[PDB]
């Protein structure tokens, strides 16, 4: 949360659509890191085919600027909520309050010229406490273009390649969910014919 503020922070956080705002008040039944169950109170319940509400939070997904957008729940079991209340602190939010970044101890003195024009001096305590470490999601999309000679396939039988490069691949040809990659490594097995007709 920003230590100093302006009072407007409680609005832009709520009026934005990034966070999961509660549409119908009531109680919270099942709190999970992915979903939220809201049992509606009987006064606001519909006279027919009524029930509860299920808010499915969005997980880590790529945005337009390769920035991960993640919704984190902020309520507990049995906690009552009202209409218009926030259910999940989205990115850059802190308990229904929009918080851009971290507050930090700052001194104003030239330290061995390491702040010569405008440069910033940071301590190892910042990176050790896992303070400013951000996450970026990058999308890699391969297309199976169709040629006038046979279609495009994703058969994982790659010729003229080492076994170490084929280790990350599954039986299908797409690497599993959670295998990191460092250098150029095949993760889609799109090998296709080229040989002309008239054979």
């Amino acid at each position: 949360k920003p230590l100093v503020g302006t009072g407007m922070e409680r609005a832009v956080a709520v009026d934005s659509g990034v966070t999961a705002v509660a549409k119908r008040g009531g109680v919270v039944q099942y709190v999970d890191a992915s979903r939220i169950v809201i049992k509606v109170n009987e006064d606001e319940m519909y006279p027919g085919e009524a029930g509860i509400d299920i808010y499915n939070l969005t997980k880590y997904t790529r945005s337009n600027q390769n920035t991960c957008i993640n919704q984190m729940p902020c309520v507990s079991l049995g906690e009552p909520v009202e209409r218009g209340d926030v259910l999940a602190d989205g990115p850059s939010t802190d308990l229904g309050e929009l918080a851009l970044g971290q507050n930090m101890r700052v001194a104003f003195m030239p330290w061995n010229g390491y702040n010569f024009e405008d440069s910033i001096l940071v301590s190892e305590r910042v990176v050790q406490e896992d303070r400013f470490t951000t996450i970026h999601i990058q999308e890699l999309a391969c297309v199976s273009r169709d040629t006038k000679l046979g279609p495009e396939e994703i058969t994982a039988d790659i010729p003229n390649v080492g076994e170490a490069a084929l280790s990350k691949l599954d039986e299908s040809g797409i690497v599993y969910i959670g295998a990191e990659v460092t250098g150029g490594d095949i993760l889609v097995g799109k090998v296709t014919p080229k040989g002309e007709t008239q054979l």
Partner: protein, 147 residues
Amino acid sequence: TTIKAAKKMVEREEAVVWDILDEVIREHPVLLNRAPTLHRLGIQAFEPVLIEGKAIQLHPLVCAAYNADFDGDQMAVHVPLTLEAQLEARALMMSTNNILSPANGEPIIVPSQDVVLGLYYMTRDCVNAKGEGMVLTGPKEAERLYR
């Protein structure tokens, strides 16, 4: 033996490639460049030292010659790649050879706010302070008494 082995070794990032890098950049100047080039001083020659990270370290005193603050400016660097080019960057493009402005007679190596503020705070004398009215035998004695 072959260039393929050397390429594989430099791609594997071994420790044997590092001392070679210290040998080849010991006296190999490079060409520092600013994206907007107004005058001849926007391009200079510099002796690089290897620093860890992903940013270029630059002398603070030459920054005033580039007119480029540290608010996110991105600077470029080229290599001479040729004997004539190396000795040319040394002779006609070194930062030491370019200290006076090509427009007027004032030096372009004018100090900046930090060092001049430090010197002003240092030489600004008061009326009463610790060690007033004593006698000193030399600058080294003064430094010792201050420390």
